[PDB]
Design a protein around this ligand. Structure first.
Ligand SMILES: NS(=O)(=O)c1c(F)c(F)c(S(=O)(=O)CCO)c(NC2CCCCCCC2)c1F
Ligand SMILES: [Zn+2]
Length: 257
């Protein structure tokens, strides 16, 4: 039932998911002059050399590129995190126009899209157990702006017309997610939640400062995707982002400056 339209969008989620109005909801605006540099943050460690992608899936909300997480191959560690988090999937949120689409904002600036690389805390044994825990997930968020093409994204863009509609999937092996990272790993971090229902408060957010650039043609192909299933009226998959939520009793920490 939930979605992104007038009738079922973010303003409505709280009726099914009361936690929508809870104390640690995501996304948030990152006020760069209030975030404080934290010298105790350990360097971040993104180890994706052994990452094994399997499949790409249009889930009716976004598209997910899924990884094999049945052993410790592609992990995120360090930074604010204790222990080892395993990459399970990534997806994006994007807009109908280049001036909107990201979930986090930076001094109220919206980017054209935001990539979320989702990882679960291996001390909880499976991701379904991890989402029930306040430190169960670590999501690495990366902003996209429109400018020069991102070569490492083109394999994703290419396969999208084979998963145009809700519930379609395609084989998607040997994709290397290192090709989606910016040069710097400087980041902001704060405790928050999944940004779609069920809005669980189980996420350590790590949001990179440096956006990646993608081309206008690349982002245009995201906007050709459909929210609907095959044989249903076409509703373009655009604007699948939740707006910034209240920061409440949280501090956003910077890894830099
Ligand atoms: N935008 S996000 O990174 O916070 C997000 C959600 F908001 C979210 F609700 C989900 S979901 O699976 O709970 C509902 C449909 O996507 C996922 N998916 C991943 C994280 C949640 C469970 C851990 C396994 C990987 C799926 C998810 F990645
Ligand atoms: Zn997301």
């Amino acid at each position: 039932h939930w979605g992104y339209g007038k009738h079922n969008g973010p303003e409505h989620w709280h009726k099914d998911f009361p936690i929508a109005k809870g104390e640690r909801q995501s996304p948030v605006d990152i006020d760069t002059h209030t975030a404080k540099y934290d010298p105790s943050l350990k360097p971040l460690s993104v180890s994706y050399d052994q990452a094994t992608s399997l499949r790409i899936l249009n889930n009716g909300h976004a598209f997910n590129v899924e990884f094999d997480d049945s052993q410790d191959k592609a992990v995120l560690k360090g930074g604010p995190l204790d222990g080892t988090y395993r990459l399970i999937q990534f997806h994006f949120h994007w807009g109908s126009l280049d001036g909107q689409g990201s979930e986090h904002t930076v001094d109220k600036k919206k980017y054209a899209a935001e990539l979320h690389l989702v990882h679960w805390n291996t001390k909880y044994g499976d991701f379904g157990k991890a989402v029930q825990q306040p430190d169960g997930l670590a999501v690495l968020g990366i902003f996209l702006k429109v400018g020069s093409a991102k070569p490492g994204l083109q394999k994703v863009v290419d396969v999208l017309d084979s998963i145009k509609t809700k519930g379609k999937s395609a084989d998607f092996t040997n994709f290397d997610p290192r090709g989606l990272l910016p040069e710097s790993l400087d980041y902001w971090t704060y405790p928050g939640s999944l940004t779609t229902p069920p809005l669980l408060e189980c996420v350590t957010w790590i949001v990179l400062k440096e956006p990646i650039s993608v081309s206008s043609e690349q982002v245009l192909k995201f906007r050709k995707l459909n929210f609907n299933g095959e044989g249903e009226p076409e509703e373009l998959m655009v604007d699948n982002w939740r707006p910034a939520q209240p920061l409440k009793n949280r501090q956003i920490k910077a890894s830099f400056k």
